[PDB]
Nucleic acid binder design. Structure first.
Lengths: 88, 110, 98, 99, 98, 110, 98, 86
DNA sequence: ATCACCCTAACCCTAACCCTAACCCTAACCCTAACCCTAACCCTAACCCTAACCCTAACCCTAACCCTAACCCTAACCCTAACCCTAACCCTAACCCTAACCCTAACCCTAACCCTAACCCTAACCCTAACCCTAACCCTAAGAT
DNA sequence: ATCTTAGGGTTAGGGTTAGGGTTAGGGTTAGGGTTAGGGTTAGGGTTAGGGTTAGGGTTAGGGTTAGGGTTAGGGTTAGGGTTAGGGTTAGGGTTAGGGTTAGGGTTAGGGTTAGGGTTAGGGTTAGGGTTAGGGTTAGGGTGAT
């Protein structure tokens, strides 16, 4: 018949402590305070929201229900973060 | 009854397509009219920049003892060249990584 | 009758330029995507600046003069010098063939 | 006693290892779940291409790595080697993100 | 026969709006210049975004929908909400009078 | 034969010029064609933003006991509102000055 | 003995004074000479409108004031009150200028 | 007709002027080495803006730099300026 | 822990001046009306790409433990920047003079647009083999004591 | 100097994808015809650069001094390194159905053009909002008790 959806809860904790450590290591960070992780998650969330909002706007303008890679590329470009390798 | 066609790219001695660049200029809502020499100049500039980057990336690929260029080599080429780094300063390259830099104060004393 | 639209790219010309600069080197699919993105980005930047230049000075046409000025405004020093040289040479050669 | 490295040795080793590589550092499934959760309030019943989620992941990781480089500079400015939340906040304020 | 070209401005309209909001308040020359710059800046931003939106979707026309989407992209929360409300209201009133 | 003219600004209930905006859209190389409602929507949005700024600036001028608005009042209005500050983050107002702000650590201790 | 303010009092008074006003803080004529000297390298026998030099001065002063605000934040971050050249260097590095 | 070459005008940005600019930015105490660093910074900024302004002027086949040239140069540097005919 | 004394910014009153707001004319630009044609809407069908689900196995994450070294706080000191004063100098302002320069008007011509046919180039598709990755093994330099 | 360990260099083998080869259809080029955008010349207003004078506000340099930046030392706690157990993600697989996209048919909305009337820009002028100058005063800083 119809394929219904389900809601999602508390997935920000999926960005784990080891992942944030690795991201800092690629950034050249040697020693990390314990209160960084929470901070980092907040930062990430904000970033994501903004991009996703813009992307969804693009998707709604074309009257599509699917967010494509080009929507993300345009959303990032209009925030001063151009991305190569996904089109455009 | 008509002369054999020669590409405008071969007239200008280029590899990039002058005709396609002309069409893109005409269709892109940049101005009412496009001069005959604008697509030639633009194609020449694009070709020069492409050759610029590709030469540096090929050098990087040979340094790591590989035959193909991957995005890592492009990233290294861009970030190790001052002017290319300035031109592409706000650009992210997918699967490129970062330059290997460690701050001097972080290294062990002995 | 149901046929997908074709999609153009710069892969052929980028491969030609690669075979000129490095006869033996090959390129990956992802790197070719990166190069297509780069070419489109630069095209848009230069064309936009030329459009603005024409509008400021109340001209209806984009000529090689606007392209040259845009190149000088957008590229750093030595890149701008060499790009201008290549552009002028190309236009001169094109005009010399009637 | 069994062999034991002194603090910071493995950290330097990891710095070198992860600056040499190019793969993604966040797990794909949790990141996808987070993306879908965030998107669910802008519009219900959205679909995503795989490439859209991959593009988002690439952009997010690049952003975080840049921010960590700036945070490291701020931490060294204050004669420390440990990064703290105040370093992140200073870097974001100066960048123009106002945090 | 040798007369200088006229210069357009939004000073008339800015003054009208000012008299609506603050009936007993004036504005200096410099403040009016700044207001002109602001209106031109916002016009350029919105129109450019709308043009890009029309180009992405292979459409040859800039319509009220493109302007609406551009407004939602370019303005912060409450600004975008109220601006969208004003635009929709104006278009409805314009259509009502044939 | 011909009915008396009504401005398109009056039909939309606006003070900003719908005709001028329509012309500027047609001659700006934005797209091949311009819809009927696009200039109306754009004029309404521009008028709204103008009124917002002018209200805040008038309040700022009244706080300094002045009749006229000067660039300082515009600067204070823009920088004291979160959304307007965000909209004009990369904008310099000539003769605008800066907001009074001193870090708490610089103040005398006792 | 004669009155004497403690160190830092007059500095706070000056901060309050200069954050309250809007005038240009650099002498006009020396700045004009500097502008002409810099421009003579790019082209010889240039001319400038008055408004051009005024616009340049407005922009420069705004830029330096913003930089000093960021520099002050960097200095306070290091548990200091004095700004030093390394603070300027850090601020510019993070801004993306150097 | 005759034009005179100028030199070492960077010293015209005096110590008091730099102190005032620091005061407007809320600085309380200033090290002695700040002034030279500031002069270098201003020099770089001005060179970058003036080069673009002169490019705009030369494209128009003029010899006088106008305020609109400066406004365009600043706008493309990422620093929009209101109040000079934008 | 008020307190006398003293400096500075703010408040108020008056003359005056210059910048704004009102008025008038007029040329240009917007509105109306008739006409035409193509972009955009619409409805159908077609394939296909994403969400949902099951399995499973290795691999990454989590928590507990031990320990050291980095961070923070305190005291001492010393040198550097703030504050103040005075002599002089260089900016500011007001004025003139002229040559360079920027703008407009009339003229006209050639470069750019438009349409059409046809033919050459590039995208889609297939197929193979060579570069890249994986697994096992050995050297080799650097770390900790 | 000594033991230990982790990343790197070598080799054999599989396998994924990049590079070469066909084919066709559509996008570029040649050829002819038309027109208006821009280049050329002359003339005229206008405005930026150079020179003058006067004065007075701002800068530079020297002297006194305090307090802020630098350094050394000592304690302590928090973050790094390590290890075992178990959760969960990465990969493979299938299915179906909802969503995207093309294709043919209409139509009405937007572009064009011409005539005429409204309105916004340019130029002139008076008066009142703002400013400069002079005189209190209220708040807050500083050394003393």
């Amino acid at each position: 018949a119809k394929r219904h959806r389900k809601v999602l809860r508390d997935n920000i904790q999926g960005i784990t402590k080891p992942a944030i450590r690795r991201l800092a290591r690629r950034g050249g960070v040697k020693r990390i305070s314990g209160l960084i992780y929470e901070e980092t998650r907040g930062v990430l969330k904000v970033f994501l929201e903004n991009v996703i909002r813009d992307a969804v706007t693009y998707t709604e303008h074309a009257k599509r229900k699917t967010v494509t890679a080009m929507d993300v590329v345009y959303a990032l470009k209009r925030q001063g973060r151009t991305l190569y390798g996904f089109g455009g | 009854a008509r002369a054999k066609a020669k590409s405008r790219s071969s007239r200008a001695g280029l590899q990039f397509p002058v005709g396609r660049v002309h069409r893109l200029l005409r269709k892109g809502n940049y101005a009412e009219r496009v001069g005959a020499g604008a697509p030639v100049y633009l194609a020449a500039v694009l070709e020069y920049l492409t050759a610029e980057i590709l030469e540096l990336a090929g050098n990087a690929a040979r340094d790591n003892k590989k035959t193909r260029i991957i995005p890592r080599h492009l990233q290294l080429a861009i970030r190790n060249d001052e002017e290319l780094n300035k031109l592409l300063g706000r650009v992210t390259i997918a699967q490129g990584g970062v330059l290997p830099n460690i701050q001097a104060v972080l290294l062990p004393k002995k | 009758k149901r046929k997908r639209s074709r999609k153009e790219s710069y892969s052929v010309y980028v491969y030609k330029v690669l075979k000129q600069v490095h006869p033996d080197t090959g390129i990956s699919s992802k790197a070719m995507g990166i190069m297509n993105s780069f070419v489109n980005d630069i095209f848009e930047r230069i064309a936009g600046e030329a459009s603005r230049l024409a509008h400021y000075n109340k001209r209806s046409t984009i000529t090689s003069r606007e392209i040259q000025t845009a190149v000088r405004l957008l590229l750093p020093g030595e890149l701008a010098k060499h790009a201008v040289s290549e552009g002028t040479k190309a236009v001169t050669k094109y005009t010399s063939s009637k | 006693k069994p062999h034991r490295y002194r603090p910071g040795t493995v950290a330097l080793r990891e710095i070198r290892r992860y600056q040499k590589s190019t793969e993604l550092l966040i797990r794909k499934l949790p990141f996808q779940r987070l993306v879908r959760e965030i998107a669910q309030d802008f519009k219900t019943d959205l679909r995503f291409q795989s490439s859209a989620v991959m593009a988002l992941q690439e952009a997010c990781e690049a952003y975080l790595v840049g921010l960590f480089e700036d945070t490291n500079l701020c931490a060294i400015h204050a004669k420390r080697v440990t990064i703290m939340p105040k370093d992140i906040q200073l870097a974001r304020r100066i960048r123009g993100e106002r945090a």
